[PDB]
Design a protein around this ligand. Structure first.
Ligand SMILES: CC(C)(C)OC(=O)N[C@@H](Cc1ccccc1)[C@H](O)CNC[C@@H](O)[C@H](Cc1ccccc1)NC(=O)OC(C)(C)C
Lengths: 99, 99
């Protein structure tokens, strides 16, 4: 798809049998999702966004199907105001920014 | 330009006659820059991000040059860790996301 930015770039993802809407975020290095029951061993980690830090659980080699494309990567789960898809997965779908 | 996401999508901007580097951020509704010296009136405003909220000052009608293109918009100035170009200026340079 081609997506213009008059509105938030939101897309449907499927993670761990669950359906979610997430934001295509080119300013996000990492992918971070609201708290969810994701299976496996995760590792605690702190991340910094515009207003300070949040502790997250780091889960590796997780399958995420984004707008239909299957991607595998590291997903952080924590208290975030929004489900963000960052650069670690955007590179996988071959997403480019154009102007 | 075509920009891939293997790296942070950074661009050079000129504002209030100072040269700065900023992130193309599709996940941000707004534009927000580190603490700088800008002329005119402003208004206190709190924004919400990951980690919590920050107090910024809003300036409207501010000229900005993005990767050598002109735009006029609202700019929020605060203690952001990074200079962020959000969807309010991105729609102006005609930027889109492709995948
Ligand atoms: C998630 C993380 C891996 C921590 O990356 C960032 O937070 N990256 C920042 C750049 C940055 C890096 C390091 C430290 C500080 C800032 C971008 O603004 C990320 N895009 C912004 C988007 O995630 C966020 C989505 C959102 C939606 C609803 C509520 C809160 C937040 N919008 C966002 O923060 O927008 C404003 C800047 C306008 C507050």
């Amino acid at each position: 798809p081609q997506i213009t930015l008059w509105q938030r770039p939101l897309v449907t993802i499927k993670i761990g049998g669950q359906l979610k809407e997430a934001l295509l975020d080119t300013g996000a290095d990492d992918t971070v999702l609201e708290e969810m029951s994701l299976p496996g061993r995760w590792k605690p980690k702190m991340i910094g966004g515009i207003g300070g830090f949040i502790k997250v659980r780091q889960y590796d080699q997780i399958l995420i199907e984004i707008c239909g494309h299957k991607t595998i990567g590291t997903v952080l789960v924590g208290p975030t105001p929004a489900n963000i898809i960052g650069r670690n997965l955007l590179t996988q779908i071959g997403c480019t920014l154009n102007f």
